[PDB]
Write a protein that binds this ligand. Structure first.
Ligand SMILES: CCc1cn2c3c(cc(C(=O)N[C@@H](Cc4ccccc4)[C@H](O)CNCc4cccc(OC)c4)cc13)N(C)S(=O)(=O)CC2
Length: 374
């Protein structure tokens, strides 16, 4: 019943339908494992088709406290309160939850995105103003009998997917689920132990891959990498694809690359393998990323004699972010109850006739180094 309950536009997030207040007000809400505040547009905005009207909800309670939340992209400010919330195509329950009513924002809402708010699915430790503001999923678990776990199947301009709350839907993946430990419960922080481009190790001290943290983040589009790792990755992808020369602006994500419709040279771009820490000492597994994932299609009727793409790997000063283009084609299980993240090949997996995205292991390392940065 919960399958295919996500929609979205490429590069603009995935959202689920929710209702807030009594009587229920329907809003589309972006699913974000990279933050912990539930917030909704609550005042008119040029890019909002609708917004939360507190005056029409008898169950709304003002907490008489303001809140400000800056993301990597965009920021908003709002007023804290609580109200009743439901998920029409999720669990059939109603819970009272904290809600930030967004009254002002900057570069947060996206023109034509079809969502009006954001659902932060991470832990209280990174909630604003502080960790006493209980996140939605915590409220959901406390107030209902829903198991402490959710899974995301994000599929690759209209896109779709499934958010399954309370369990795992085996129809959504094939093969085995591999688990990596959640290192610390704030973001969904994980540990990358090795990175290869077309089978070739980048050969860095593995702490570099996790400077200063690595997270799984559905609310971020790109694979974001620490500067040192980003430069190494680009050098290696350039080398692999050297049969064609692209403008420096493409690698900086400032420019599109286009080919005649249907002629994208996928084969000249390498597969990227990210090895994640396993649940056993010095063991790991890898997820493999095809160019069909990290070259993101940019839909534009004006350019449609061609297929055009943006490079969806970018530089970070705040650690590695495994964003939506990494999650796409995998079934990702956020197993909060057992403090682990599971990965499996998704039913909507990425592949052509030569290569397939994969989740595989086990791999062993002799080096006994802890790859966590802290
Ligand atoms: C999906 C819209 C989007 C596009 N892009 C990006 C983007 C970042 C974020 C981003 O910051 N997303 C946060 C949520 C969000 C979703 C839609 C629109 C605006 C923001 C996400 O929560 C980031 N999670 C890490 C983080 C960083 C800083 C403060 C936080 O506070 C708790 C959380 C969103 C987009 N870039 C930096 S990027 O390199 O992935 C490429 C462009």
């Amino acid at each position: 019943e919960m399958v295919d309950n996500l929609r979205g536009k490429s590069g603009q997030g995935y959202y689920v339908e929710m209702t807030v207040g009594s009587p229920p007000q329907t809003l589309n809400i972006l699913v974000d494992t990279g933050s912990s505040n539930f917030a909704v547009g609550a005042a008119p905005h040029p890019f909002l088709h609708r917004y939360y009207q507190r005056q029409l909800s008898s169950t709304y309670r003002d907490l008489r406290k303001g809140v400000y939340v800056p993301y990597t992209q965009g920021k908003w400010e709002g007023e804290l309160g609580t109200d009743l919330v439901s998920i029409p195509h999720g669990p059939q329950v109603t819970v009272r939850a904290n809600i930030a009513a967004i009254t002002e924002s900057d570069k947060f809402f996206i023109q034509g995105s079809n969502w009006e708010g954001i659902l932060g699915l991470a832990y209280a430790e990174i909630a604003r103003p502080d960790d006493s503001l209980e996140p939605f999923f915590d409220s959901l678990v406390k107030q209902t009998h829903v198991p402490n776990l959710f899974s995301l199947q994000l599929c690759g301009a209209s896109v779709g997917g499934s958010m399954i709350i309370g369990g795992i839907d085996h129809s959504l993946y094939t093969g085995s689920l591999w688990y990596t430990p959640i290192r610390r419960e704030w973001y969904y922080e994980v540990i990358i132990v090795r990175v290869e481009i077309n089978g070739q190790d980048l050969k860095m001290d593995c702490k570099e891959y996790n400077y200063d943290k690595s997270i799984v983040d559905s609310g971020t589009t790109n694979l974001r990498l620490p500067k040192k790792v980003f430069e190494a990755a680009v050098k290696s992808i350039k080398a692999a694809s050297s049969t064609e020369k692209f403008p420096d602006g493409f690698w900086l994500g400032e420019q599109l690359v286009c080919w005649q419709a249907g002629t994208t040279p996928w084969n000249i771009f390498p597969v990227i393998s990210l090895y994640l820490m396993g649940e056993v000492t010095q063991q790991s597994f890898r997820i493999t990323i095809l160019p069909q994932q990290y070259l993101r299609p940019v839909e534009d009727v004006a350019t449609s004699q061609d297929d055009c793409y943006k490079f969806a790997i970018s530089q970070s000063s705040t650690g590695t972010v495994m964003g939506a283009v990494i999650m796409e084609g995998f079934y990702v299980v956020f197993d909060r109850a057992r403090k682990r993240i599971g990965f499996a090949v998704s039913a909507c997996h990425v592949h052509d006739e030569f290569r397939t995205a994969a989740v595989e292991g086990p791999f062993v390392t002799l080096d006994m180094e802890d790859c966590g940065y802290n």
